[model samples]
Target chain A: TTPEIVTAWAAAWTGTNPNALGTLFAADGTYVDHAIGATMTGREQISGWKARTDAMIENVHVTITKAYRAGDHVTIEAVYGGHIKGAPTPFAVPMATLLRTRGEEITSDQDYYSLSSVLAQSGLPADWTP
Target chain B: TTPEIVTAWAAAWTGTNPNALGTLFAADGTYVDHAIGATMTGREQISGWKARTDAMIENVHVTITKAYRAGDHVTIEAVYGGHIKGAPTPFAVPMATLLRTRGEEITSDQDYYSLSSVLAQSGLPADWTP
Candidate 1:
């Protein structure tokens, strides 16, 4: 049952279809990316990310390196490797994410990665202006 | 006195000569490298690090990016970049370290950096064989 939950969560995440992707986010969910100083709240906020990601990445695969469950919270260290549509090199980033679950559904998430490395690899500057 | 202490600690750390390097560490201090999961307790363990470092890195420079002093505890964000004797590329890693001092002497210290990045850069296989 836990396997099915984790698998379904991971499946919807890397599925790269907006409709499929949108199903994963809870109505009042909050997604925080500490690395980029970006905060997405409510289901509507994830729309941009889903649209952008679906367009940008292909052959997206995520490997959950380790997962620890404590009550209804699961902390996972994951490695995501995929190719950007117009990029020559593969995009791989190791992320540590906290998933807060309610029964079979993930309700909130916090993601961590290095902003410096991500920006450099993605050919963008580390913008901390705000 | 603070500047003198900082300079002395920095010099002794990058000096490479064990006798000179040994002066900064306390007689019964603990040096923890969280990145490598290597804990060096007391002054003797640092002897190996000094000896190994002296033979490896060259032109070592450490830039203290940010520092905050709250009473006796000083937390510093620093970037260490230097060339190794036989290595073609430069070595750079950003580290955040906490230094505990007693008067002008740094009595204990703990250093943090990214273990995976450091291992890949240092030709180490992220070893946990011990």
Candidate 2:
């Protein structure tokens, strides 16, 4: 169940060719993109952001640094790299994604990435106020 | 300090109108987005995300549901309504973004959201993984 899910997710998400989405996530999932200030729950929720994500960027890459399963949960640490328009360098954000699963499906997930890095790259001041 | 930082970050973010940003955050910060899997430290890291975000999303709207300050940290539950395209409805994922702060700056933040709601809204299955 885990492998199948990961494969399908990977196929759905174009960031990686290996299809780790299902492997890395539970059926019932939780996704929080702290940088974008976006949060999602379950597979259905994740899909909403996928279209926006697919429409948003160009070449993308994700590498899992560490991942392990304990009971119904899987926690992972990884690095995501990609370039956006008007940025001098690609976003090298260190992140962690947490997934809670039931049997072979992910029940929940949470993501951790550095926003400061993205902001600094964007020419936004560290102390600017809205 | 909370209001100031929110203002600064809000100014940094395009989705929000009005200066509610400054009225919201603390000085030191903690931000965790479960969906995006990004974690940021202080204002510096949040700044990093602001850039890539500018390159990615088109438009965004944020509304606070519940907000309260406990000691130096603030816990806020909010609902974000927006379109991710190819989605039948606005991605209305229930979310909670937790922020920890110092004097006048946000020190930490963690965001909770449902991916299932997004997937369902985006034409995905409840049992889907990734």
Which candidate should be chosen as best, given DockQ against the real structure?
A: 1
Name the weakest run of 10 consecutive residues (lDDT summed) in model 1 chain B. B121-130
Q: What is the lDDT of residue B89 in candidate 2?
A: 49
Error of 2 at A118 (Å): 2.2
DockQ of 1: 0.04
Model 2 residue A5 distance off true place after TM-score fit, in angstroms: 6.4
Cα TM-score per model: 0.46, 0.41
Clashes of each: 0, 93
Computed on alpha carbons, the lDDT of every model, listed in order, comes to: 0.59, 0.52
Q: Candidate 2's residue-wise lDDT over B52-74, tens digit each?
A: 44343335555654454545545
DockQ of model 2 vs. true complex: 0.03
Docking class for model 1 is: incorrect
Give the per-residue Cα lDDT of candidate 1 at B8.
61
